[PDB]
Amino acid sequence: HEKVTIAPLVLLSALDHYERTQTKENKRCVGVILGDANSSTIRVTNSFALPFEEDEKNSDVWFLDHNYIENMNEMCKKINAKEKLIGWYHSGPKLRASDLKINELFKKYTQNNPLLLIVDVKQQGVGLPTDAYVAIEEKTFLHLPCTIEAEEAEEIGVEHLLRIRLTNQLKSLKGLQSKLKDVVEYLDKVIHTILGKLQDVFNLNNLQKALTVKTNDELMVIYISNLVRSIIAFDDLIENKIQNKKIQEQRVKD
Amino acid sequence: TLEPSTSITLAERQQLAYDLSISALLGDKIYNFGELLHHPIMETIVNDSNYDWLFQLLNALTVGDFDKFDSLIKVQISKIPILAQHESFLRQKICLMTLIETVFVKNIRMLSFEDISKATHLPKDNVEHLVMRAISLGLLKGSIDQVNELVTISWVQPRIISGDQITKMKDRLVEWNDQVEKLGKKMEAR
Amino acid sequence: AIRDEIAKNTELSYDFLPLSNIKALLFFNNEKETEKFALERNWPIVNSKVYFNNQSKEKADYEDEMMHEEDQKTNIIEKAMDYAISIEN
């Protein structure tokens, strides 16, 4: 569907919000997110703290004002027209039924169904400390995957930060970790049919056929250059370097 | 849709759910097999009268014996006799689904054909139709080896149950996983 | 000592061999002489003929975990090659 761009600026700021707000896990610092949502890839330009109150002692009890967004967008629009409201964020890390109320408030203010944003203010788990949800509805809400863009100007300052293969595997466990547990969770949580829906694609393995072995067929030619890869290495430098040395070492006139 | 709301009456409740349970029959279907019978249409529907049938039909939705029911048949059900085809449609599919769901587990497909198809205890020359028909059953995939008398099959079979492959699941999938880490040691790291 | 090899050679050359021939091979007078060996060899046998259903030991525990060393070794090879690419630094 509309799965979205992610703005580090947002992400950072939202955490400084979290920081600034002195928010603890008792709370989730919330606020507007900005972008333009029309495309099958929504973009997140920006995002804004909505000064807020959250109480899960009584869930539906919590406080927020729109008049921010009122005053906000005006300036924001005046700042940039592309800022048009795409949705909103919060801290998280995880959902609370208070959300849905919060959710639909923005539906007043959004073109499409507005966007939740989970953050992990502790940035703990994985790729993203983040989720973004959109109500669907029997309610639905849903996370489409998202990611960062360039934002190179960001990436440039980002370049001032940091400083091939393996990781690709490294999630090998993750879902599989919780997964069977997740079963045994629900298994011994209730001790749904979706799970059985998950099931049949398990057989989708031990599948391997001679069809497999055709791999090496391919893998054969794959290796042809392995010499040639280094054959030119196998050729040039120290030939010439010796020459160059023979030049240089014989240079040595006076 | 009514599921959340709308208090009703039983004569509204069952009789609809009857007609529903009936329209299961005048469905019949892409089977189905199992259904909303789980949901509180049951006791509620069955009980008795044609619900007995409607329940016994759920039995035939499993048992699939004609004369456990073609016994039972009065007008209303014989009113559409095509269930006599549908129960064959059942029996096959009913046999099939578990024959499909389990019997091969070991990357299930073959089931091919005849004795396996007569293992539906519906005979071989009807197999030459019923088993022969696939999405001419509305459903089955795969194909026929006439000579070797082999069904080629593919999916278009959904299914259920629990407890079993549950453990198996993570095992292999943590198996490579763990073992990978051996290879998965230094590569892009180093 | 001879015949045990022939036994395998037979076992290699043959699945199902008449008990006469194998005795003829084993140079025995009694075939039950052989029949021991065959059964001592643990050879599948019906009347009058020594059978080899499995001429060999296939599977049987060790010689495992190495070749199939399909990618793992090649992955390490890759890894190595990639270190031959990396440690090339």
Short mmCIF file of all heavy atoms in Angstrom, two decimals, chain A residues 200-237:
data_model
loop_
_atom_site.label_atom_id
_atom_site.label_comp_id
_atom_site.label_asym_id
_atom_site.label_seq_id
_atom_site.Cartn_x
_atom_site.Cartn_y
_atom_site.Cartn_z
N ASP A 200 0.63 -24.08 7.12
CA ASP A 200 0.70 -24.82 5.87
C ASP A 200 1.90 -24.39 5.03
O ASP A 200 2.40 -25.14 4.19
CB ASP A 200 -0.60 -24.63 5.09
CG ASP A 200 -1.78 -25.23 5.81
OD1 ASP A 200 -1.53 -25.97 6.78
OD2 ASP A 200 -2.94 -24.97 5.43
N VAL A 201 2.38 -23.18 5.27
CA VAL A 201 3.49 -22.66 4.50
C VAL A 201 4.78 -23.09 5.17
O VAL A 201 5.87 -22.79 4.69
CB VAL A 201 3.36 -21.13 4.40
CG1 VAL A 201 4.44 -20.52 3.52
CG2 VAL A 201 1.97 -20.76 3.94
N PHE A 202 4.66 -23.81 6.29
CA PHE A 202 5.86 -24.43 6.85
C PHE A 202 6.41 -25.43 5.86
O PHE A 202 7.60 -25.38 5.50
CB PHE A 202 5.58 -25.14 8.17
CG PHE A 202 5.03 -24.26 9.25
CD1 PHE A 202 4.64 -24.83 10.46
CD2 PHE A 202 4.93 -22.90 9.11
CE1 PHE A 202 4.12 -24.07 11.47
CE2 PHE A 202 4.42 -22.13 10.14
CZ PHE A 202 4.01 -22.71 11.32
N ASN A 203 5.56 -26.34 5.38
CA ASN A 203 5.95 -27.27 4.33
C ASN A 203 6.53 -26.57 3.13
O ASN A 203 7.34 -27.16 2.40
CB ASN A 203 4.76 -28.12 3.90
CG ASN A 203 4.31 -29.08 4.98
OD1 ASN A 203 5.10 -29.50 5.83
ND2 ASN A 203 3.03 -29.43 4.97
N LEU A 204 6.14 -25.33 2.90
CA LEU A 204 6.81 -24.48 1.95
C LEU A 204 8.17 -24.12 2.50
O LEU A 204 9.14 -24.83 2.27
CB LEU A 204 5.97 -23.24 1.66
CG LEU A 204 4.64 -23.61 1.02
CD1 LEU A 204 3.81 -22.39 0.74
CD2 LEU A 204 4.86 -24.41 -0.24
N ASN A 205 13.46 -26.40 3.43
CA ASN A 205 12.92 -27.52 4.20
C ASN A 205 13.71 -28.78 3.96
O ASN A 205 14.93 -28.76 3.82
CB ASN A 205 11.47 -27.80 3.82
CG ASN A 205 10.54 -26.68 4.20
OD1 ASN A 205 10.82 -25.91 5.11
ND2 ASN A 205 9.43 -26.59 3.50
N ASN A 206 12.97 -29.87 3.92
CA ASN A 206 13.43 -31.13 3.37
C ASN A 206 13.16 -31.21 1.87
O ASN A 206 13.42 -32.24 1.25
CB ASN A 206 12.77 -32.29 4.11
CG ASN A 206 13.17 -32.34 5.57
OD1 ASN A 206 14.21 -31.80 5.95
ND2 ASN A 206 12.35 -32.99 6.39
N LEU A 207 12.68 -30.10 1.28
CA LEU A 207 12.21 -30.04 -0.09
C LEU A 207 13.22 -30.53 -1.11
O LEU A 207 12.82 -30.91 -2.22
CB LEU A 207 11.85 -28.59 -0.43
CG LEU A 207 10.80 -27.89 0.44
CD1 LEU A 207 10.69 -26.42 0.08
CD2 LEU A 207 9.46 -28.58 0.34
N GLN A 208 14.50 -30.54 -0.77
CA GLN A 208 15.60 -30.56 -1.72
C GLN A 208 15.48 -31.71 -2.71
O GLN A 208 15.12 -32.84 -2.37
CB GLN A 208 16.94 -30.64 -0.97
CG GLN A 208 17.19 -29.39 -0.14
CD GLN A 208 16.43 -29.43 1.16
OE1 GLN A 208 15.80 -30.43 1.47
NE2 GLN A 208 16.46 -28.34 1.91
N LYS A 209 15.80 -31.38 -3.96
CA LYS A 209 15.72 -32.30 -5.08
C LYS A 209 17.08 -32.30 -5.77
O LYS A 209 17.97 -31.54 -5.39
CB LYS A 209 14.58 -31.88 -6.03
CG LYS A 209 14.34 -32.75 -7.24
CD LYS A 209 14.05 -34.17 -6.89
CE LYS A 209 13.48 -34.84 -8.10
NZ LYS A 209 14.42 -34.71 -9.24
N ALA A 210 17.23 -33.15 -6.78
CA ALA A 210 18.39 -33.03 -7.66
C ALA A 210 18.41 -31.64 -8.26
O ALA A 210 19.47 -31.11 -8.62
CB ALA A 210 18.36 -34.10 -8.75
N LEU A 211 17.22 -31.04 -8.35
CA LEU A 211 17.05 -29.65 -8.74
C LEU A 211 18.01 -28.79 -7.95
O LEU A 211 18.65 -27.89 -8.51
CB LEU A 211 15.62 -29.22 -8.46
CG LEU A 211 14.56 -30.06 -9.17
CD1 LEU A 211 13.18 -29.68 -8.69
CD2 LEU A 211 14.67 -29.95 -10.67
N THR A 212 18.12 -29.07 -6.65
CA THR A 212 19.12 -28.40 -5.83
C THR A 212 20.48 -28.46 -6.48
O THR A 212 21.15 -27.43 -6.63
CB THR A 212 19.20 -29.05 -4.46
OG1 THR A 212 17.90 -29.08 -3.86
CG2 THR A 212 20.16 -28.29 -3.57
N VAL A 213 20.89 -29.64 -6.91
CA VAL A 213 22.29 -29.88 -7.21
C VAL A 213 22.69 -29.06 -8.43
O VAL A 213 23.86 -28.69 -8.61
CB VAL A 213 22.51 -31.38 -7.40
CG1 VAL A 213 23.97 -31.74 -7.33
CG2 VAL A 213 21.65 -32.16 -6.40
N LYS A 214 21.71 -28.70 -9.25
CA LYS A 214 21.88 -27.83 -10.40
C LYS A 214 22.54 -26.53 -9.98
O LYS A 214 23.00 -25.75 -10.82
CB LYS A 214 20.53 -27.53 -11.01
CG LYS A 214 19.80 -28.74 -11.47
CD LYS A 214 18.43 -28.33 -11.94
CE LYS A 214 17.69 -29.49 -12.54
NZ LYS A 214 18.39 -29.93 -13.78
N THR A 215 22.51 -26.25 -8.69
CA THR A 215 23.17 -25.07 -8.16
C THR A 215 24.61 -25.11 -8.61
O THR A 215 25.09 -24.21 -9.31
CB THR A 215 23.10 -25.06 -6.64
OG1 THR A 215 21.78 -25.43 -6.24
CG2 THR A 215 23.38 -23.66 -6.13
N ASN A 216 25.31 -26.16 -8.18
CA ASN A 216 26.73 -26.26 -8.48
C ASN A 216 26.99 -26.09 -9.95
O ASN A 216 27.97 -25.44 -10.33
CB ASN A 216 27.26 -27.59 -8.00
CG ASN A 216 27.21 -27.72 -6.51
OD1 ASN A 216 27.14 -26.72 -5.80
ND2 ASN A 216 27.22 -28.95 -6.03
N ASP A 217 26.11 -26.62 -10.80
CA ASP A 217 26.15 -26.34 -12.23
C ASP A 217 26.46 -24.88 -12.42
O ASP A 217 27.50 -24.50 -12.97
CB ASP A 217 24.81 -26.61 -12.90
CG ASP A 217 24.60 -28.03 -13.23
OD1 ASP A 217 25.61 -28.73 -13.41
OD2 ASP A 217 23.43 -28.46 -13.30
N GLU A 218 25.52 -24.07 -11.96
CA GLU A 218 25.69 -22.63 -11.97
C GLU A 218 26.97 -22.25 -11.25
O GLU A 218 27.78 -21.47 -11.76
CB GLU A 218 24.46 -22.03 -11.30
CG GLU A 218 23.16 -22.56 -11.89
CD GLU A 218 21.96 -22.17 -11.07
OE1 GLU A 218 22.17 -21.60 -9.98
OE2 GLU A 218 20.82 -22.44 -11.48
N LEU A 219 27.19 -22.83 -10.07
CA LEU A 219 28.32 -22.43 -9.26
C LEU A 219 29.62 -22.75 -9.97
O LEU A 219 30.65 -22.11 -9.75
CB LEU A 219 28.25 -23.12 -7.90
CG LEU A 219 26.92 -22.88 -7.18
CD1 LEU A 219 26.90 -23.70 -5.91
CD2 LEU A 219 26.62 -21.42 -6.88
N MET A 220 29.57 -23.73 -10.88
CA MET A 220 30.76 -24.07 -11.65
C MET A 220 31.29 -22.82 -12.34
O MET A 220 32.30 -22.25 -11.92
CB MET A 220 30.46 -25.14 -12.70
CG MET A 220 30.03 -26.50 -12.17
SD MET A 220 30.02 -27.76 -13.47
CE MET A 220 28.69 -27.17 -14.51
N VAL A 221 30.57 -22.36 -13.37
CA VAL A 221 31.04 -21.21 -14.13
C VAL A 221 31.33 -20.03 -13.21
O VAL A 221 32.31 -19.30 -13.40
CB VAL A 221 30.02 -20.86 -15.23
CG1 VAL A 221 30.39 -19.57 -15.93
CG2 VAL A 221 29.95 -22.00 -16.24
N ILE A 222 30.56 -19.92 -12.14
CA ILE A 222 30.68 -18.86 -11.15
C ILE A 222 32.13 -18.71 -10.73
O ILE A 222 32.60 -17.61 -10.41
CB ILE A 222 29.74 -19.14 -9.95
CG1 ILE A 222 28.30 -18.82 -10.32
CG2 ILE A 222 30.12 -18.38 -8.72
CD1 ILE A 222 27.31 -18.96 -9.21
N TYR A 223 32.87 -19.80 -10.82
CA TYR A 223 34.22 -19.76 -10.33
C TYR A 223 35.24 -19.54 -11.43
O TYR A 223 36.42 -19.39 -11.13
CB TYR A 223 34.49 -21.05 -9.61
CG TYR A 223 33.55 -21.20 -8.47
CD1 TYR A 223 33.00 -22.42 -8.14
CD2 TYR A 223 33.19 -20.09 -7.73
CE1 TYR A 223 32.13 -22.55 -7.11
CE2 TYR A 223 32.32 -20.20 -6.68
CZ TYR A 223 31.79 -21.44 -6.37
OH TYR A 223 30.92 -21.57 -5.32
N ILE A 224 34.79 -19.50 -12.68
CA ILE A 224 35.75 -19.43 -13.78
C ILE A 224 36.77 -18.35 -13.57
O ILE A 224 37.98 -18.58 -13.71
CB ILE A 224 35.02 -19.23 -15.11
CG1 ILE A 224 34.37 -20.54 -15.54
CG2 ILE A 224 35.97 -18.65 -16.15
CD1 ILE A 224 33.60 -20.42 -16.80
N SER A 225 36.33 -17.15 -13.21
CA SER A 225 37.28 -16.06 -13.17
C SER A 225 38.22 -16.17 -12.00
O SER A 225 39.21 -15.44 -11.94
CB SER A 225 36.56 -14.72 -13.12
OG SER A 225 37.50 -13.67 -13.01
N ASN A 226 37.93 -17.06 -11.04
CA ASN A 226 38.61 -16.99 -9.76
C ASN A 226 40.11 -16.85 -9.94
O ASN A 226 40.77 -16.10 -9.22
CB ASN A 226 38.29 -18.20 -8.91
CG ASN A 226 36.83 -18.30 -8.58
OD1 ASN A 226 36.05 -17.38 -8.85
ND2 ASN A 226 36.45 -19.38 -7.92
N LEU A 227 40.66 -17.58 -10.89
CA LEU A 227 41.99 -17.30 -11.41
C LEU A 227 42.01 -15.89 -11.96
O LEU A 227 42.74 -15.02 -11.47
CB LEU A 227 42.34 -18.28 -12.51
CG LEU A 227 42.50 -19.75 -12.16
CD1 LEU A 227 42.78 -20.53 -13.43
CD2 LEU A 227 43.62 -19.92 -11.15
N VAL A 228 41.22 -15.68 -13.00
CA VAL A 228 41.26 -14.43 -13.74
C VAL A 228 41.05 -13.27 -12.80
O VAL A 228 41.67 -12.20 -12.95
CB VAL A 228 40.21 -14.45 -14.86
CG1 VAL A 228 40.23 -13.15 -15.61
CG2 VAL A 228 40.45 -15.63 -15.77
N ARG A 229 40.18 -13.46 -11.80
CA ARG A 229 40.00 -12.47 -10.76
C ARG A 229 41.35 -11.98 -10.28
O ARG A 229 41.61 -10.78 -10.21
CB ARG A 229 39.23 -13.07 -9.59
CG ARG A 229 37.83 -13.64 -9.84
CD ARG A 229 36.60 -12.72 -9.81
NE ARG A 229 35.40 -13.57 -9.92
CZ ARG A 229 34.14 -13.14 -10.02
NH1 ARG A 229 33.85 -11.85 -10.00
NH2 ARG A 229 33.15 -14.02 -10.12
N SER A 230 42.23 -12.91 -9.92
CA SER A 230 43.58 -12.57 -9.52
C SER A 230 44.61 -12.81 -10.61
O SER A 230 45.79 -12.56 -10.36
CB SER A 230 43.97 -13.35 -8.27
OG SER A 230 43.15 -12.99 -7.18
N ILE A 231 44.23 -13.30 -11.79
CA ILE A 231 45.24 -13.58 -12.81
C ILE A 231 46.00 -12.32 -13.17
O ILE A 231 47.20 -12.35 -13.42
CB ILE A 231 44.63 -14.23 -14.06
CG1 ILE A 231 44.48 -15.74 -13.87
CG2 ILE A 231 45.46 -13.93 -15.27
CD1 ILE A 231 43.75 -16.40 -15.00
N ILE A 232 45.32 -11.19 -13.17
CA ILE A 232 46.01 -9.96 -13.54
C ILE A 232 46.91 -9.53 -12.40
O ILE A 232 48.04 -9.08 -12.61
CB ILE A 232 44.98 -8.89 -13.92
CG1 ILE A 232 44.01 -9.55 -14.88
CG2 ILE A 232 45.66 -7.71 -14.60
CD1 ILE A 232 44.72 -10.26 -16.02
N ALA A 233 46.42 -9.68 -11.17
CA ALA A 233 47.32 -9.71 -10.04
C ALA A 233 48.43 -10.71 -10.31
O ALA A 233 49.61 -10.37 -10.25
CB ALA A 233 46.56 -10.08 -8.76
N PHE A 234 48.04 -11.92 -10.74
CA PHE A 234 49.01 -12.96 -11.06
C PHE A 234 49.99 -12.52 -12.13
O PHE A 234 50.95 -13.24 -12.42
CB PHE A 234 48.31 -14.24 -11.52
CG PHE A 234 47.49 -14.91 -10.46
CD1 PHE A 234 46.39 -15.68 -10.81
CD2 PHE A 234 47.79 -14.77 -9.12
CE1 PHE A 234 45.61 -16.28 -9.86
CE2 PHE A 234 47.03 -15.40 -8.17
CZ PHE A 234 45.94 -16.15 -8.54
N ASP A 235 49.77 -11.36 -12.73
CA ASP A 235 50.57 -10.90 -13.85
C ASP A 235 51.46 -9.72 -13.50
O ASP A 235 52.68 -9.82 -13.51
CB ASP A 235 49.63 -10.54 -15.00
CG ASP A 235 48.82 -11.72 -15.45
OD1 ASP A 235 49.21 -12.86 -15.13
OD2 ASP A 235 47.75 -11.52 -16.06
N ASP A 236 50.86 -8.58 -13.15
CA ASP A 236 51.46 -7.30 -13.51
C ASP A 236 52.47 -6.79 -12.50
O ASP A 236 53.67 -6.73 -12.78
CB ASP A 236 50.35 -6.28 -13.71
CG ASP A 236 49.47 -6.62 -14.87
OD1 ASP A 236 49.88 -7.45 -15.70
OD2 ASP A 236 48.36 -6.06 -14.94
N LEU A 237 51.98 -6.40 -11.32
CA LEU A 237 52.70 -5.45 -10.47
C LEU A 237 54.17 -5.78 -10.38
O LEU A 237 55.03 -5.07 -10.92
CB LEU A 237 52.11 -5.45 -9.06
CG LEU A 237 50.70 -4.95 -8.81
CD1 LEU A 237 50.33 -5.24 -7.37
CD2 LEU A 237 50.59 -3.46 -9.08
#
